[PDB]
Design a protein around this ligand. Structure first.
Ligand SMILES: [Cu+]
Length: 150
């Protein structure tokens, strides 16, 4: 479900991502990993996803791990989504990415000084997946990243 957090809270959650960055790649390790993504942190290009302070990085996940994903929409005016699919780029204006493997659906826009966020779990099998936002035109212009489970 959808929850709300104040800026100090958002800032504290962003540090909860336990991957290591190398180039434009974030590598996770362990039985349970925590991915913390944000939709357009302030200062970053629009439209885009930020994970561990990097723009649309490629995520490296160990096959068999339990993936705990936390998604925060910090972009004023838009209700970005965070959906995992198997279909890769390029995406159309209205992406055709069914079936979604795991996803959040459209998020609430920031309001009253609070930002919406949600959590979901994922147990993926080895392979290649893509996290994308389904708002028309967004994925088409770069709001997607790659996930490598191996
Ligand atoms: Cu979006």
């Amino acid at each position: 479900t959808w929850k709300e957090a104040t800026l100090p809270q958002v800032k504290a959650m962003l540090e909860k991502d336990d991957g290591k960055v190398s180039g434009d790649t974030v590598t996770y390790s362990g039985k349970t990993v925590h991915v913390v993504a944000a939709a357009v942190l302030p200062g970053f290009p629009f439209p885009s996803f930020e994970v561990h302070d990097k723009k649309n990085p490629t995520l490296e996940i160990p096959a068999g791990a339990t993936v705990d994903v936390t998604f925060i929409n910090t972009n004023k005016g838009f209700g970005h989504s965070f959906d995992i699919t198997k279909k890769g780029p390029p995406y159309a204006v209205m992406p055709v990415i069914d079936p979604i493997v795991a996803g959040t659906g459209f998020s609430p826009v920031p309001k009253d000084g609070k930002f919406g966020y949600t959590d979901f779990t994922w147990h993926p099998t080895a392979g290649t997946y893509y996290y994308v936002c389904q708002i028309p035109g967004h994925a088409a212009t770069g709001m997607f990243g790659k996930i490598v489970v191996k």
